[PDB]
Amino acid sequence: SMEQVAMELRLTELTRLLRSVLDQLQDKDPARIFAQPVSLKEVPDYLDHIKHPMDFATMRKRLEAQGYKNLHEFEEDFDLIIDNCMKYNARDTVFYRAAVRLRDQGGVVLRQARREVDSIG
């Protein structure tokens, strides 16, 4: 149907905008601490601590399959990256501190992304 096509076009355009948001957020992680999944070979106990691991590569795979239906879903995955890190790692670590700085800088980006998603529809 044409209604289905129009909905698919909206999802495509949201995907475009979330790809630009993802790039901007990932630039706030210049150390690449959040680029890839925590390795279970290197951190064998990880899934005992963290029940829903997340990272920027995993988000990019979901995004390219158009798997984010709305901005809330995308934000949920970004908050997992930050919140997982801040639980597993202590305050005194470069990992925790990277997560704080990514949260603080990413808030700016997300505040305007929400206005754009609502504005464009």
88: nearest Cα among 53, 36, 41, 58:
53
The DSSP secondary structure of the chain, one letter per residue, reads -HHHHHHHHHHHHHHHHHHHHHHHHHHT-TT-TTSSPPPTTTSTTHHHH-SS---HHHHHHHHHTT---SHHHHHHHHHHHHHHHHHHS-TTSHHHHHHHHHHHHHHHHHHHHHHHHHHH-
- Resolution to 1 decimal place, in Å: 1.5
- Give the C-alpha distances (Å, rounded to integers) separating 45 from 41, 95, 98: 9, 17, 22
Question: What is the end-to-end Cα distance of the chain in Å, rounded?
Answer: 21
Give dist(CA 22, CA 90) in Å, integer.
26
Domain ranges of the chain: 1-121
How would CATH label the architecture of 1-121?
Up-down Bundle (1.20)
- Please state, as a whole number, how many other Cβ atoms lie within 10 Å of the Cβ of residue 37: 13
Residue found under tokens 């951190």: 43
Give dist(CA 89, CA 72) in Å, integer.
26
Task: Give the determination technique.
Answer: X-ray
Give dist(CA 64, CA 78) in Å, integer.
16
